[PDB]
Swiss-Prot record:
UniProt binding sites for Zn(2+): 229, 235-236, 243
Part of the full-length chain shown: 162 to 521 of 522
Phosphoserine found at: 52, 144, 273-274
Renumbered ranges of motif Nuclear localization signal: 134-144
Function: Nucleotidyltransferase that catalyzes the formation of cyclic GMP-AMP (2',3'-cGAMP) from ATP and GTP and plays a key role in innate immunity. Catalysis involves both the formation of a 2',5' phosphodiester linkage at the GpA step and the formation of a 3',5' phosphodiester linkage at the ApG step, producing c[G(2',5')pA(3',5')p].
Higher taxonomy: Eukaryota, Metazoa, Chordata, Craniata, Vertebrata
Binding residues annotated for GTP, in chain numbering: 50, 158, 215-222
Single GO molecular function: poly-ADP-D-ribose modification-dependent protein binding
Protein name: Cyclic GMP-AMP synthase
Resulting phenotype, residue 54 to A: Strongly reduced tyrosine phosphorylation
């Protein structure tokens, strides 16, 4: 309770850090957008800010930003890849007008690897010409859909090409976004009338990938739900309606980062990400729909509700994608049994002992 409040104070971002960091990102992102808008393929490219900074749940330091460079793609037709629910081939319908994206077609299929390789090539050419800002491209590992840049040896930015489709959401999402009892059926209907996005992350095929495939993304809806998160339309707009939803997500994020640090010696928790705690947090919001279940004075119990549900996901080896229910973030194809059992034991110990990982 009071220990958690002190943790949240420590996690607060400094306004001086926010300002200098955003300015460095803006300088790079703006320069990259200008160049890309000169290419015919990436002509109508547009900025879409996503991830924890723009959801206001980034913790500790503003040193990681996520942006999508969305491309409006009309007349788009999807073909699910091998029942994976999240990965798709992209096609166009009947060539009614000739395409800007025709150079990336492998037959009738729009190749994600071709589009991403050219996107990456342009950004690489551009970063070694920026206004005396030190910018370096990093390719981690894990098949990220992003081009990752390090600015001033300090600030990471993920730049993700994303196709924008204004069509109805794919059938695999029909039972997802279960917000009806929390944010209302009205809101769910309005949200599902919004575009969805496809990012160039490929389905796995042995040692390699299906290099034409794309993956569904609802990162923009995640931001909208986090920034408009109450049952009451005035949640967090006045002194009588201060909930602790965002504080709970922040604490979950910090719990995971701290444990990943304490297990750096064998990198046992390497496969776990903040997106796992984010997804579990959205499910707890569905389970606890009332703002009164997130009262600021109940921070300790609400965080406990969050921790217990995440443990249950670990122990049952099931964490459903909030938008695609049959996509299991915790399947053995993605995270091994040993890793999940390991994190369960640690979170179990931390909970039973009032989170010593949070002591100063
Ligand atoms: N496994 C995934 N499935 C679907 N979307 C993902 C996945 N991993 C990341 N994302 C999307 O990418 C965005 C940026 O991811 P990132 O790893 O930067 O985490 P984040 O939410 O920004 O939190 P933080 O950066 O503070 O760890 C996420 O908000 C999420 O929308
Ligand atoms: N700006 C954005 C937003 C959404 C996505 C993204 C989308 C989908 Cl669908 C999946 Cl499966 C994704 N996996 C990862 C990302 C991602 C992005 N990513 C990181 O941000 C690491 O910090 C790597 C891991 C990408 N960039
Ligand atoms: Mg991020
Ligand atoms: Mg990121
Ligand atoms: Zn609120």
């Amino acid at each position: 309770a009071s220990k958690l409040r002190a943790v949240l104070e420590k996690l607060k971002l400094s306004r001086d850090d926010i300002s200098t960091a955003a300015g460095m990102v803006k300088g790079v992102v703006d320069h990259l957008l200008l160049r890309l808008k000169c290419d015919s393929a990436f002509r109508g490219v547009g900025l879409l800010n996503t991830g924890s900074y723009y959801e206001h749940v980034k913790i500790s330091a503003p040193n990681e930003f996520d942006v999508m460079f969305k491309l409006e793609v009309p007349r788009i037709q999807l073909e699910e890849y091998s029942n994976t629910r999240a990965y798709y081939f992209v096609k166009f319908k009947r060539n009614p007008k000739e395409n800007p994206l025709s150079q990336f077609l492998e037959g009738e299929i729009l190749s994600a690897s071709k589009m991403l390789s050219k996107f990456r090539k342009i950004i690489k050419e551009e970063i070694n010409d920026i206004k005396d800002t030190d910018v370096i491209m990093k390719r981690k590992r894990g098949g990220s859909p992003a081009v990752t840049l390090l600015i001033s040896e300090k600030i990471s930015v993920d730049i993700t090409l994303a196709l924008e489709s204004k069509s109805s959401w794919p059938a695999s999402t029909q039972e997802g976004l279960r917000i009806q009892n929390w944010l209302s059926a009205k809101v769910r209907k309005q949200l599902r009338l919004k575009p969805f996005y496809l990012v160039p992350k490929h389905a796995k095929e042995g040692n390699g990938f299906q290099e034409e495939t794309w993956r569904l993304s609802f990162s923009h809806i995640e931001k909208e739900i986090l920034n408009n998160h109450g049952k009451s339309k005035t949640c967090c707009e006045n002194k009588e309606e201060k909930c602790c939803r965002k504080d709970c997500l922040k604490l979950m994020k910090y719990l995971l980062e701290q444990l990943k640090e304490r297990f750096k010696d064998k990198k046992h928790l390497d496969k776990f990400s903040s997106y796992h705690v984010k997804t579990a947090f959205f499910h707890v919001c569905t389970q606890n729909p009332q703002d009164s279940q997130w009262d600021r004075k109940d921070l300790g119990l609400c965080f406990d509700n969050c921790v217990t549900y995440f443990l249950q996901c670990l122990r049952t080896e099931k964490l459903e994608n909030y938008f695609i229910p049959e996509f299991n973030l915790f399947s053995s194809n993605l995270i091994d049994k040993r890793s999940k059992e390991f994190l369960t034991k640690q979170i179990e110990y931390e909970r039973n002992n009032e989170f010593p990982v949070f002591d100063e």
